[PDB]
Amino acid sequence: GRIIYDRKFLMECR
């Protein structure tokens, strides 16, 4: 299972 994060989630983490 490839680990995928969209930009919305990544930015929320930022």
Added chain:
Amino acid sequence: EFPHPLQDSWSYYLFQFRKALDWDECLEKVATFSTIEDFWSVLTHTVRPREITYGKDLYMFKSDIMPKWEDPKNENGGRWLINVTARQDVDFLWDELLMLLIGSDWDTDEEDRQICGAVFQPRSRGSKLSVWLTSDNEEETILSIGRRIKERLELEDTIYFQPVSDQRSQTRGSDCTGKYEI
């Protein structure tokens, strides 16, 4: 707050030219990261694209892949080349590009497999962003990657896919085509 692991481990390099160093000796590895948290920490602790001095470049590559043509994963590959326009924010372009790569936000496993790394090159005559791919002849995958890059970076101008062979033979200062274009 357990860290969020990435699909891949990545390494981040600065290219800084000094006299009498070979090209590859001007590269230095400033971080290796494998979590969303450490990805963002690298960016917060290194120079922003909009602040970088001309000719000092940023390379982000899957950790097992050296950021140079000579790597087995790069030697038969090619890059999507993006010519930055005056109106574009290079901070946005770089951040969106790296998010797309480290988040592996491609439709298919196969596209992710093609990915080697990304490069930011600030230049007086016009800056360049690139994504390096492992092959030069997986047309369908290469094209879907190019299409996704344009979407995520909100690019209007044509982007160019240039095999390593063409990159090697390119003359510094020549004014732009590709094996594929979109």
